[PDB]
């Protein structure tokens, strides 16, 4: 299981958000902590991504692009898994110090997006997703959203995506296998609409931000203003397995 060996070896460890759980919840404090967490996890997503089998085959502009287009989906999927494994989807386990109960879901003003993420989390149990299936699906997710006009070196991306699909089929193979690939790819497809809803909410927040006054950091202001609108405007779109 060379491939699975590597995926387990590069998998990032726990990441905390830095949230003050001793203060009462507010919209501003929750979103500041999600921004901080989002930025800390992005660092781990880059380290992880650069270590993936064949990732260096990609043109370096495409390496950078692909991480920024898929990072929200990656985080959503990974958070859903943590939620499932740590608290049986009872709450959303963003980080060990940032666990969302329904009240925080409501307070964050992202209730509809949280309910969908909690549903994603429950499917990990309904489908009895293995940790090894989890690792392969998450890797495939990195290669599942691209510009409609193509990447700098599209052929190398194509063959890379192909190999990750082949390895996912492998640990399903290792009929039954038929129904399973179907179910897992439906689950993967469902990640993308949730990431877009998070993007739309947060884009709107950045723009109005002057009014709802919330300090957008660093890398976040850049990614939401430079890359995220490509996705919201349809210039960058998910690669779906199934027709939506």
């Amino acid at each position: 299981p060379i491939f699975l060996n590597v995926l387990e070896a590069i998998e990032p460890g726990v990441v905390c958000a830095g949230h003050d759980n001793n203060q009462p919840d507010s919209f501003a404090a929750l979103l500041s902590s999600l921004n901080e967490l989002g930025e800390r996890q992005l660092v781990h997503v880059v380290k992880w991504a650069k270590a993936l089998p064949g990732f260096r085959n990609l043109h370096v502009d495409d390496q950078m692009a692909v991480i920024q287009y898929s990072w929200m989906g990656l985080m959503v999927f990974a958070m859903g898994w943590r939620s499932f494994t740590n608290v049986n989807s009872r709450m959303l386990y963003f980080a060990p110090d940032l666990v969302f109960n329904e009240y925080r879901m409501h307070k964050s003003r992202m209730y509809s997006q949280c309910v969908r993420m909690r549903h994603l989390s429950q499917e990990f149990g309904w489908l009895q997703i293995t940790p090894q299936e989890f690792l392969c699906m998450k890797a495939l997710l990195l290669f599942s959203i691209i510009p409609v006009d193509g990447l700098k070196n599209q052929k190398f991306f194509d063959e890379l995506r192909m190999n990750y699909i082949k390895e996912l089929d492998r640990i399903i193979a290792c009929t039954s296998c038929s129904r399973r690939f179907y179910q897992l790819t439906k689950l993967l497809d469902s990640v993308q609409p949730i990431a877009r809803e998070l993007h739309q909410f947060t884009f709107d927040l950045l723009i109005k931000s002057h009014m709802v006054s919330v300090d957008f950091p660093e890398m976040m202001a850049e990614i939401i203003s430079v890359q995220v609108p490509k996705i919201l405007s349809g210039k960058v779109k998910p690669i779906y397995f199934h027709t939506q």
Binding site: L42, V43, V46, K50, Q68, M219, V226
Partner: peptide, 11 residues
């Protein structure tokens, strides 16, 4: 850009 700085910062 900030993202490129990060990306390049990673070994």
């Amino acid at each position: 850009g900030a993202f490129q700085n990060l990306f390049q910062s990673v070994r």
